[PDB]
Amino acid sequence: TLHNIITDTENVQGSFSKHEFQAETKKLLDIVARSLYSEKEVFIRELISNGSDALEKLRHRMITAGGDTAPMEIHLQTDSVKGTFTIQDTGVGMNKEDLVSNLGTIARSGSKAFLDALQNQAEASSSIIGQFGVGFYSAFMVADKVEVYSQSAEADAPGYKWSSDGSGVFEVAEASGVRQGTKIVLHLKDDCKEFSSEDRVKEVVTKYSNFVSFPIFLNGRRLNTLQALWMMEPKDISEWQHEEFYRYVAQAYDKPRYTLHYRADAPLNIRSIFYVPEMKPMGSSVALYSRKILIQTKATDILPKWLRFLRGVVDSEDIPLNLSRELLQESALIRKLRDVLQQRVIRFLLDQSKKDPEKYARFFEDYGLFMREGIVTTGEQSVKEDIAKLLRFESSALPAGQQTSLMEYSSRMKAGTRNIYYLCAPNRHLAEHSPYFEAMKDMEVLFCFEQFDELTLLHLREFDRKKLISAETRLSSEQAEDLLAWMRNALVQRVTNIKVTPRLDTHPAMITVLEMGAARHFLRTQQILQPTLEINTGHDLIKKLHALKDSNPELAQLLLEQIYDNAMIAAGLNEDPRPMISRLNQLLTRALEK
Amino acid sequence: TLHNIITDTENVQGSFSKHEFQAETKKLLDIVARSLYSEKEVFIRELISNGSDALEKLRHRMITAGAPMEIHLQTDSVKGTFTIQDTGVGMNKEDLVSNLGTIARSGSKAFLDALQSSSIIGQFGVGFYSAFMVADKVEVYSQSAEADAPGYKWSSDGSGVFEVAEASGVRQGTKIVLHLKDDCKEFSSEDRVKEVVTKYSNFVSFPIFLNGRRLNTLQALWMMEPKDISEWQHEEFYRYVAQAYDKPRYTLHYRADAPLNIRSIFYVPEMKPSMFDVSREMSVALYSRKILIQTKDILPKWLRFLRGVVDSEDIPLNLSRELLQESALIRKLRDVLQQRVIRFLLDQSKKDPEKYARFFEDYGLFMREGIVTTGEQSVKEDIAKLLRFESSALPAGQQTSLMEYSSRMKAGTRNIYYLCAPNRHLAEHSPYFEAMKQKDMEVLFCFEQFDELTLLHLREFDRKKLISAETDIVVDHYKEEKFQDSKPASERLSSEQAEDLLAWMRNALVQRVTNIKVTPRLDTHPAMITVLEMGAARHFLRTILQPTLEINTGHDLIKKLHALKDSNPELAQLLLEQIYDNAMIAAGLNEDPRPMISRLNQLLTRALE
Ligand SMILES: Nc1ncnc2c1ncn2[C@@H]1O[C@H](COP(=O)(O)OP(=O)(O)O)[C@@H](O)[C@H]1O
Ligand SMILES: Nc1ncnc2c1ncn2[C@@H]1O[C@H](COP(=O)(O)OP(=O)(O)O)[C@@H](O)[C@H]1O
Ligand code: BEF
Ligand code: BEF
Ligand SMILES: [Co+2]
Ligand SMILES: [Co+2]
Ligand SMILES: [Co+2]
Ligand SMILES: [Co+2]
Ligand SMILES: [Mg+2]
Ligand SMILES: [Mg+2]
């Protein structure tokens, strides 16, 4: 039933003309200045990056030719009456030939050419931002008209004025008195007048360009420029610099409880700092930077989903950037970086689990849901068991409240079998009285009390080739029976079985449950599943129950309901006993007729 | 105090040269191949889109006059090739050279302006070069219509040059062959190519065949007349967009042209949301024309339970066609959609209150979230309109709303009273309600566990302050409002017995309570705990509050306690401690009830003599 028409029918029956690829220049300018960025404000990022590059070239140049004590800075000026945005740097500037070439030609980058001639380990090779040759045209996004004044440091080269409206043509004339470097004046479109507002410019500068290495001034005022902590030696960073940097980078008001300052060079250059907040659960995630400039507020491809609880920053200088500079290209190197980072963070958290198990215990209670989620969603067994190292549970051999890893269980496994038995229960009381538990008379059972603990072990399957397997695979003798047959008569629509058990002392009764899909079904029903009473015939209230049933057919009932309800609370199946209170008050009142 | 260097000093000297912008073609080609599109797979979308446009041009050419218009895909694993062929209008030599041999030239842009339909996808003039993301050799065979035009083979590397020759066996339309480079062999996999078609091109308006088999392309339901869509078509479309197996309980098919173009459909699943899926964070797809535009940002966070699709011609596309421009435009779209969805949900409650009750039970958590996290009062109140409660002024819910409470308001009153309790019975016989019954105000009864928090965050509704019954009871102490006891003095403890009892209680509960007082406001309850900010206290207890213990000297239990302090004094202290615990539990201020059990059993044994 196939329908295909693709057929090898074509033969070239002629000569062979040869052409070169062309570019429609007019249209290309329109694209860059329109359908490139997601946001207009981004022209500021571009112009400042260009200023930085210009200064950085000048700094490189004065390593050999120096040295002027000329100051290296970027100035921004707003004029809200003329509707202009102006940016000036005191960098290397441009002569006439470099204005025509660099500005007049789309995709032509002088910074790229400058980078390509550097010794591969000169400092400028890491700090230069531009290489596409298009960012300057982002000015036409917001400006009807653009004027560039430029003075190069040269053979007393004259100053020059470049001007364009962005519609295919530009003018260049000689000028004075242009200061060494480059001044760019944007005559803003009516719809872009907001970029002649001081407060708005300031918002853009701090958003993208807050860690630019040269001083930024706006209307003669120094902006609050921060240090890119991630670029520095981890032992030149104090704990209290990390605290301030974290709050800034995470938009937080607490302190990091964990800090991982990670640096390396393969598969990519990476300078990064991760934080775990102290507070139990823009800057809602880890930010991506390249050469100290924001690429994405919320980095998408560099970390796994389950690690989204980390705050902080990743900076790579050779990460392949998309032309918009707000996305990353598809790369085997980005993929490897995510793998590398996943292991690095896992490794870091293990180490912390040893240094301070108590602090790690606190960490796990708060953020353990993410490990659980990670184990479930990632369909690769090798890493499921890498995330699983971070999990904690209680045990059938260890005291209540005390945590163990799978490792501390897998170690204590006898040479006999190679499979791990868990019992996922709402709490300790119910675990210790599971019939399935008592099957394990002698084997140790992991007690998994946390939400989705059952789900992860299901999705886990195996750990260290060991298998995860749910472990769910006085008063005479007729006085009791009479009382029993009587208790079954009032709890008809509630419990199923009323046993009698010789293992009670202070408690008159207790509730047990067989299968715990239903126990974890009740709750969360409230916003009736097979419970079982067990009676202590030695207890006074039970002995007081047996008698009163015939001496009081209106008061006893209260004593029965109460004993039942008290047992349900004791089992952790009723933590909001609001419904019993008024009744209990009736019981106490009727009891206290003395 | 200022440091500036920007001064108006620059003056033009002499004349000026005029210049035309230029372009560096080879680096441009490279930018398109390596830096333009985030994902390599997208060349399938770009080539299919070009095929769709060519078929529209031909369809429009063949309307003045009297072949099956289709797009064929073929994968050769052995040869490492990806092939696409459309039966479209084709290209002549001058077309191949000017349109394909020129970056940013768009024949599809010039065809449009020569109509003075809206089905043409291509405007940038660059989509075709996406092939060089995945291919180190591209051949193009094209036959124009009619036009007494010969066939042509276009071929490139593509770096700088391309050849153009005459070919003989060219079918009407265009065939393109990609010799896949080696890190891109996945695109000679049928299963892989198919994933991309259905991802980006699943609504193109011509049949697409892959290796001889027709792909299940769909109608763009959202662009069509709401009345022409059956319930069953919505069932199927829902399953596709939400990737689900159940059906929608509600369907909102929304169009609008002012203030912005909008073509959308939204669904609420019949299945309850997974609480795991709710906690973790993973929505709605965004489209232009009929091609998927990568994004999901469009709805406020509280409306993430919705599934379906949004299309708006007012969202312009970035060059890569995966990002959308105008971020404030989006906030407006988001505001419009939020407002429209609230209206829809309100109409659903009116139309079918039983069905809405099920919806509110399953999804209400989202509305409470939306109210708590929004900062705008009017948005919080808009969402609050969706909330449902019961009332003291109506039998068993019988679900009412804040608006309906407002309309029953008196002249008159400047407050909306509520009481949060876990069910209807407990509210009705709450000691806090017995106290409010002495007033003639209506009380909302709220049963969900996060209702309190929600109303605390809401604060007011339609300029009316929300006050919990518990709070109001405390404020009344400082208003010197007067109330009569529900029983006469004959069956209450005398004044002297009251204070005598109180001074004993204060001694027996020293660091546990601030005040202990008599209250004339209870009937069936012996006591209650009061705390001005009761709601905030309850919320704070999630892992001492200056509580007041108020007693009812008419209650037999309290009166009995008075007797016990001089009869069995030890028993009186155990009783007292139990009443306090009882009042704490009933106030919802207890911590963990288990350490009280053994204590309560000790109390029962002593009383049962
Ligand atoms: N402020 C400036 N000072 C000196 N030269 C500049 C300045 N801005 C731009 N240039 C030159 O113009 C070229 C093009 O700028 P741009 O369009 O941003 O491309 P790139 O990606 O190379 O930065 C730069 O490579 C640089 O040579
Ligand atoms: N399959 C095709 N059939 C006919 N013409 C085509 C085809 N593919 C491309 N073209 C022509 O080449 C031009 C450039 O295509 P493309 O690079 O996608 O830019 P755009 O599609 O945005 O115009 C198109 O405008 C169209 O005129
Ligand atoms: F600033 Be360039 F275009 F990368
Ligand atoms: F297909 Be075009 F590049 F919009
Ligand atoms: Co041949
Ligand atoms: Co080199
Ligand atoms: Co002037
Ligand atoms: Co009225
Ligand atoms: Mg640049
Ligand atoms: Mg196209």
Side-chain angles (χ1 to χ4, degrees):
Chain A
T1 37
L2 299 180
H3 174 65
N4 203 350
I5 74 170
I6 298 170
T7 38
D8 180 38
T9 54
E10 299 88 357
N11 289 337
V12 49
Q13 293 190 1
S15 79
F16 296 96
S17 178
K18 180 158 64 180
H19 317 261
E20 277 184 353
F21 285 109
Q22 317 310 321
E24 201 182 349
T25 299
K26 306 271 175 305
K27 183 114 182 62
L28 218 33
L29 292 166
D30 169 71
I31 295 174
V32 182
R34 225 176 119 215
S35 336
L36 217 39
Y37 310 108
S38 71
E39 270 160 328
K40 260 158 189 162
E41 68 185 355
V42 133
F43 75 98
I44 291 170
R45 192 193 57 206
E46 289 310 303
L47 297 181
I48 287 175
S49 283
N50 288 339
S52 187
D53 290 349
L55 286 160
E56 186 59 40
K57 285 169 186 180
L58 174 55
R59 174 200 282 146
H60 186 261
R61 174 177 189 158
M62 306 174 313
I63 304 175
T64 65
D68 300 326
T69 77
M72 305 191 103
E73 45 191 45
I74 298 181
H75 290 252
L76 304 182
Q77 179 171 272
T78 56
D79 183 327
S80 52
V81 182
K82 280 170 172 169
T84 61
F85 169 104
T86 289
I87 173 169
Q88 191 172 329
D89 68 77
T90 50
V92 81
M94 281 182 285
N95 59 13
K96 178 183 178 180
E97 294 74 26
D98 286 34
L99 284 164
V100 177
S101 171
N102 292 327
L103 297 190
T105 301
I106 306 175
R108 161 75 182 129
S109 178
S111 297
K112 197 46 177 172
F114 172 90
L115 271 167
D116 298 337
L118 296 182
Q119 286 149 270
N120 303 342
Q121 293 199 309
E123 319 216 311
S125 93
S126 64
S127 60
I128 300 259
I129 298 138
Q131 29 119 350
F132 290 127
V134 311
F136 164 84
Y137 310 111
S138 66
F140 303 98
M141 200 155 45
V142 293
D144 283 346
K145 195 185 198 298
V146 174
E147 293 152 314
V148 170
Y149 303 90
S150 203
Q151 175 66 70
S152 82
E154 244 185 45
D156 292 328
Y160 287 97
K161 176 183 184 173
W162 188 95
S163 65
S164 187
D165 65 356
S167 68
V169 156
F170 68 87
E171 297 186 352
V172 170
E174 228 185 275
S176 43
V178 194
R179 176 181 173 142
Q180 170 66 49
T182 304
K183 181 169 71 180
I184 305 174
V185 182
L186 308 195
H187 302 256
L188 304 166
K189 298 171 197 176
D190 295 328
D191 73 347
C192 296
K193 287 303 162 43
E194 67 188 308
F195 303 115
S196 61
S197 173
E198 179 170 284
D199 289 330
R200 176 90 187 96
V201 165
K202 194 181 294 179
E203 297 179 1
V204 186
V205 173
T206 78
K207 175 170 182 178
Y208 298 98
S209 290
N210 192 31
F211 302 93
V212 152
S213 38
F214 303 94
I216 310 285
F217 296 86
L218 171 58
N219 297 327
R221 297 195 117 100
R222 176 76 163 99
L223 295 191
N224 290 278
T225 280
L226 291 172
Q227 281 179 317
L229 283 210
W230 60 86
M231 295 305 203
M232 300 168 161
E233 301 284 296
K235 298 191 176 183
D236 277 331
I237 316 301
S238 63
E239 176 152 356
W240 301 89
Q241 287 175 285
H242 273 295
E243 293 193 26
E244 307 203 8
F245 179 76
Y246 158 77
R247 286 178 215 115
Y248 179 91
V249 162
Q251 323 280 359
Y253 306 97
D254 60 338
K255 302 174 314 177
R257 86 177 77 187
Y258 288 136
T259 296
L260 169 59
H261 190 164
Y262 178 73
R263 320 171 64 216
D265 314 292
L268 294 164
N269 166 264
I270 185 182
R271 312 280 96 117
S272 57
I273 302 172
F274 307 95
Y275 298 115
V276 183
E278 266 176 349
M279 260 269 313
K280 183 178 185 204
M282 294 300 293
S284 299
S285 60
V286 171
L288 176 64
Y289 279 76
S290 185
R291 315 186 177 233
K292 294 175 165 181
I293 294 162
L294 183 65
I295 310 299
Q296 295 167 322
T297 285
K298 280 166 277 197
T300 50
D301 306 318
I302 61 158
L303 294 164
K305 307 305 180 36
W306 79 276
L307 284 172
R308 73 195 172 276
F309 66 91
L310 296 165
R311 300 288 93 113
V313 50
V314 174
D315 188 331
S316 173
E317 66 187 39
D318 56 3
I319 213 164
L321 298 178
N322 179 275
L323 192 63
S324 64
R325 295 177 171 275
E326 54 180 296
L327 293 170
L328 289 187
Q329 294 305 87
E330 169 178 14
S331 192
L333 306 175
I334 322 283
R335 277 172 254 146
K336 186 169 198 185
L337 177 65
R338 181 167 67 248
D339 293 352
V340 160
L341 285 181
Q342 177 163 240
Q343 291 302 305
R344 190 57 184 88
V345 172
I346 288 183
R347 181 173 155 246
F348 169 86
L349 292 169
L350 285 207
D351 300 332
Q352 306 309 307
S353 150
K354 277 216 176 327
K355 288 193 160 30
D356 192 326
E358 277 88 13
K359 168 152 179 169
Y360 182 87
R362 298 186 268 270
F363 159 75
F364 186 72
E365 178 174 315
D366 292 330
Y367 291 94
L369 194 53
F370 298 101
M371 276 72 107
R372 284 183 249 271
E373 160 179 340
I375 296 190
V376 176
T377 55
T378 73
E380 187 160 319
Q381 180 67 29
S382 42
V383 62
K384 281 186 189 299
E385 293 184 41
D386 292 325
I387 304 171
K389 311 167 171 179
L390 303 168
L391 301 185
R392 302 312 173 110
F393 312 96
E394 297 199 8
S395 185
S396 60
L398 295 174
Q402 296 199 345
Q403 303 294 313
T404 54
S405 59
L406 293 179
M407 290 302 303
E408 297 167 312
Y409 170 95
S410 172
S411 61
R412 283 164 35 237
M413 289 183 54
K414 284 190 170 184
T417 60
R418 283 195 170 191
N419 64 34
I420 79 171
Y421 300 113
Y422 65 86
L423 173 56
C424 297
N427 62 11
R428 173 54 73 95
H429 170 292
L430 287 178
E432 283 182 348
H433 306 116
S434 181
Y436 288 91
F437 167 63
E438 273 297 315
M440 322 301 181
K441 314 150 186 175
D442 279 34
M443 209 78 189
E444 195 215 304
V445 193
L446 281 184
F447 291 163
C448 45
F449 300 145
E450 300 300 326
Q451 186 173 355
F452 313 109
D453 263 350
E454 177 156 288
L455 186 52
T456 75
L457 302 190
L458 265 281
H459 279 74
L460 187 46
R461 297 168 179 184
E462 70 216 48
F463 183 75
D464 270 333
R465 306 178 188 88
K466 313 220 161 182
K467 281 295 203 298
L468 281 65
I469 303 197
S470 171
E472 293 186 312
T473 292
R474 302 298 304 160
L475 208 69
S476 90
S477 62
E478 179 61 58
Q479 293 170 342
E481 290 288 350
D482 188 29
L483 174 58
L484 282 178
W486 184 96
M487 291 184 302
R488 312 166 191 268
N489 202 15
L491 311 170
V492 175
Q493 305 263 348
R494 304 181 177 267
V495 283
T496 74
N497 307 68
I498 313 189
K499 211 68 190 182
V500 169
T501 43
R503 43 156 177 165
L504 296 174
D505 194 349
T506 63
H507 301 280
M510 59 178 272
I511 310 297
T512 60
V513 179
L514 187 136
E515 260 165 347
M516 279 162 174
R520 182 197 294 105
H521 195 216
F522 178 105
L523 277 179
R524 312 161 159 182
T525 36
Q526 289 80 246
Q527 283 159 309
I528 170 61
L529 298 178
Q530 306 191 23
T532 299
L533 258 182
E534 293 189 6
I535 300 293
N536 176 228
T537 59
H539 206 283
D540 302 320
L541 297 171
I542 290 303
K543 284 199 265 49
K544 284 312 163 194
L545 193 68
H546 167 82
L548 268 60
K549 69 177 179 54
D550 298 318
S551 319
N552 288 290
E554 295 148 356
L555 200 166
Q557 195 64 198
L558 306 168
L559 179 56
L560 181 70
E561 292 298 316
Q562 199 54 61
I563 290 172
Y564 168 66
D565 275 335
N566 287 340
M568 289 285 292
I569 296 168
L573 289 178
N574 180 225
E575 63 281 55
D576 190 344
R578 257 128 91 194
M580 92 194 185
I581 295 297
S582 72
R583 187 190 65 226
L584 174 49
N585 286 343
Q586 301 165 26
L587 170 58
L588 287 169
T589 304
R590 298 222 227 174
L592 283 165
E593 294 170 357
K594 51 193 283 181
Chain B
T1 48
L2 292 205
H3 181 52
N4 213 321
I5 64 168
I6 302 180
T7 55
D8 198 320
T9 59
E10 302 85 356
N11 286 296
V12 174
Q13 297 296 328
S15 188
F16 55 97
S17 45
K18 278 175 200 156
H19 301 266
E20 197 142 53
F21 288 102
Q22 296 174 1
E24 203 172 300
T25 313
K26 310 179 199 164
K27 180 172 184 174
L28 272 175
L29 276 175
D30 185 80
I31 284 163
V32 174
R34 314 191 302 119
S35 307
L36 189 51
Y37 309 100
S38 297
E39 298 205 55
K40 299 164 175 289
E41 67 184 15
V42 175
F43 82 92
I44 293 175
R45 175 202 70 205
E46 288 314 289
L47 272 33
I48 287 159
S49 277
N50 283 339
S52 181
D53 297 335
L55 287 160
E56 279 297 321
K57 293 186 195 176
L58 172 67
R59 165 180 278 145
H60 170 275
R61 178 165 289 251
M62 310 302 183
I63 279 183
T64 35
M69 296 184 302
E70 42 192 52
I71 297 184
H72 285 265
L73 305 188
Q74 179 168 86
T75 61
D76 196 315
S77 289
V78 173
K79 302 179 198 178
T81 58
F82 177 94
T83 315
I84 175 171
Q85 178 177 340
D86 61 82
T87 58
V89 79
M91 275 174 288
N92 57 38
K93 187 203 185 186
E94 185 265 299
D95 282 336
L96 290 160
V97 178
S98 308
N99 294 10
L100 285 186
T102 300
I103 313 289
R105 193 174 310 277
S106 184
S108 297
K109 209 185 179 66
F111 164 79
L112 286 184
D113 318 334
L115 301 185
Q116 295 166 9
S117 307
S118 67
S119 45
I120 301 297
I121 295 150
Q123 59 172 303
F124 299 122
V126 317
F128 168 83
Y129 307 99
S130 68
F132 299 106
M133 282 197 294
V134 301
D136 60 342
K137 263 276 169 45
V138 177
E139 297 132 67
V140 172
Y141 304 82
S142 185
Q143 170 60 88
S144 175
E146 185 267 0
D148 281 332
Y152 295 100
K153 171 182 190 165
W154 186 97
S155 68
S156 190
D157 286 344
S159 305
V161 293
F162 61 86
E163 313 179 4
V164 173
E166 271 202 16
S168 74
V170 190
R171 192 188 204 108
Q172 173 82 83
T174 304
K175 183 173 64 176
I176 306 173
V177 190
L178 306 195
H179 298 254
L180 298 165
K181 74 188 55 172
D182 306 352
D183 57 302
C184 295
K185 283 308 174 55
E186 70 201 275
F187 305 109
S188 76
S189 166
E190 171 169 88
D191 305 287
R192 176 72 183 104
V193 159
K194 173 166 162 181
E195 276 187 0
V196 185
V197 177
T198 74
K199 176 169 174 175
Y200 300 93
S201 303
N202 199 23
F203 298 95
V204 316
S205 64
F206 304 97
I208 302 188
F209 290 78
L210 176 55
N211 302 322
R213 289 154 177 168
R214 193 189 174 122
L215 307 180
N216 295 315
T217 73
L218 298 164
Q219 286 200 302
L221 286 210
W222 68 89
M223 306 165 62
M224 303 177 322
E225 283 295 278
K227 89 199 165 162
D228 293 344
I229 303 176
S230 66
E231 210 153 57
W232 193 88
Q233 283 165 302
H234 273 293
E235 270 198 20
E236 300 274 274
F237 186 74
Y238 160 82
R239 279 172 215 120
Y240 154 79
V241 288
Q243 293 177 335
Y245 61 82
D246 64 320
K247 71 198 189 205
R249 74 177 79 189
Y250 293 128
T251 293
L252 165 63
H253 192 168
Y254 177 56
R255 291 130 63 244
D257 280 305
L260 295 174
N261 172 269
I262 294 172
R263 301 289 189 262
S264 61
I265 300 164
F266 299 99
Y267 299 112
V268 175
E270 209 187 20
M271 60 174 33
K272 304 167 70 52
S274 179
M275 294 308 183
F276 177 86
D277 291 338
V278 163
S279 69
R280 75 182 284 234
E281 284 126 20
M282 50 204 69
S283 39
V284 151
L286 190 139
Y287 280 83
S288 173
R289 264 49 176 161
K290 305 154 181 281
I291 309 315
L292 168 74
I293 302 318
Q294 215 56 34
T295 300
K296 287 172 163 187
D297 312 70
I298 248 59
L299 290 171
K301 171 163 148 52
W302 76 275
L303 281 169
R304 68 193 185 271
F305 66 87
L306 291 176
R307 308 293 241 120
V309 64
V310 169
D311 188 326
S312 170
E313 303 219 61
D314 290 333
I315 315 298
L317 299 182
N318 63 347
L319 183 58
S320 58
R321 305 169 161 274
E322 48 173 322
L323 284 178
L324 43 80
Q325 311 181 292
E326 310 277 332
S327 184
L329 173 70
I330 273 61
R331 198 180 312 121
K332 178 152 187 160
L333 178 57
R334 295 176 64 186
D335 293 352
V336 163
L337 293 174
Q338 181 173 236
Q339 233 49 47
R340 183 59 182 102
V341 157
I342 284 148
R343 167 141 71 80
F344 174 77
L345 288 169
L346 284 179
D347 294 336
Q348 299 320 302
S349 163
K350 290 142 185 174
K351 174 179 304 196
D352 198 341
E354 179 204 352
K355 181 183 194 193
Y356 184 83
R358 300 199 301 273
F359 165 74
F360 185 68
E361 201 219 357
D362 287 334
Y363 287 94
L365 71 85
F366 287 102
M367 297 146 219
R368 302 190 191 87
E369 176 194 287
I371 289 157
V372 172
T373 71
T374 311
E376 295 257 52
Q377 184 62 39
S378 61
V379 179
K380 292 175 184 295
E381 288 180 38
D382 281 332
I383 295 172
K385 291 178 199 182
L386 298 174
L387 296 175
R388 294 287 168 275
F389 306 106
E390 301 201 12
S391 176
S392 58
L394 324 155
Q398 194 77 15
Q399 282 184 312
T400 191
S401 70
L402 293 159
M403 305 220 291
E404 295 175 4
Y405 183 110
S406 290
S407 41
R408 292 168 206 112
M409 277 188 95
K410 299 296 183 181
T413 39
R414 284 264 157 118
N415 297 312
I416 296 174
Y417 298 94
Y418 65 86
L419 175 67
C420 299
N423 66 37
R424 181 63 192 227
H425 188 254
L426 292 172
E428 264 171 357
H429 303 81
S430 183
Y432 303 115
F433 187 67
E434 293 183 335
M436 289 290 287
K437 279 158 68 178
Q438 304 176 311
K439 296 181 171 179
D440 279 341
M441 307 279 91
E442 192 192 323
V443 178
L444 292 184
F445 289 156
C446 339
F447 312 142
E448 282 309 300
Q449 73 167 329
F450 299 113
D451 277 329
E452 263 283 18
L453 186 64
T454 303
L455 298 177
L456 284 163
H457 276 81
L458 179 61
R459 263 186 42 248
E460 52 187 301
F461 184 89
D462 194 15
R463 302 199 142 94
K464 291 142 188 320
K465 236 69 164 63
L466 292 149
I467 289 85
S468 73
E470 297 97 348
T471 295
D472 197 72
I473 288 167
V474 171
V475 171
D476 288 331
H477 286 296
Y478 302 86
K479 282 191 168 167
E480 206 187 10
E481 293 298 324
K482 191 175 174 174
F483 304 95
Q484 294 85 341
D485 308 85
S486 52
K487 302 190 179 94
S490 325
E491 32 182 4
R492 292 195 313 270
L493 295 179
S494 56
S495 190
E496 308 84 299
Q497 286 165 338
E499 297 291 344
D500 194 328
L501 167 62
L502 288 167
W504 171 75
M505 295 181 60
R506 294 194 186 95
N507 285 331
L509 298 169
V510 211
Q511 281 168 1
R512 297 193 282 295
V513 305
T514 293
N515 295 309
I516 313 195
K517 59 194 52 158
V518 184
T519 185
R521 306 192 61 190
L522 297 178
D523 180 34
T524 76
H525 307 267
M528 61 175 171
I529 287 280
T530 64
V531 170
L532 173 63
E533 294 181 277
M534 183 61 88
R538 294 181 181 150
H539 180 54
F540 181 77
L541 277 54
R542 277 319 191 257
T543 299
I544 301 288
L545 326 168
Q546 307 177 281
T548 306
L549 185 63
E550 319 218 1
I551 59 177
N552 165 15
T553 65
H555 199 287
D556 287 316
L557 187 49
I558 301 299
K559 285 193 295 182
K560 298 292 180 65
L561 182 65
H562 171 76
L564 284 171
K565 76 192 187 66
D566 300 317
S567 161
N568 195 337
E570 182 67 24
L571 179 57
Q573 183 170 20
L574 302 165
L575 175 56
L576 174 59
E577 179 53 26
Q578 192 63 48
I579 294 174
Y580 167 75
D581 291 333
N582 287 9
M584 288 299 279
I585 298 180
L589 296 167
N590 59 284
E591 300 178 4
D592 181 280
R594 293 169 277 187
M596 176 178 73
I597 298 311
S598 69
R599 194 160 63 251
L600 172 61
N601 293 349
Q602 290 178 322
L603 173 55
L604 296 173
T605 45
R606 287 218 204 194
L608 295 190
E609 326 285 72

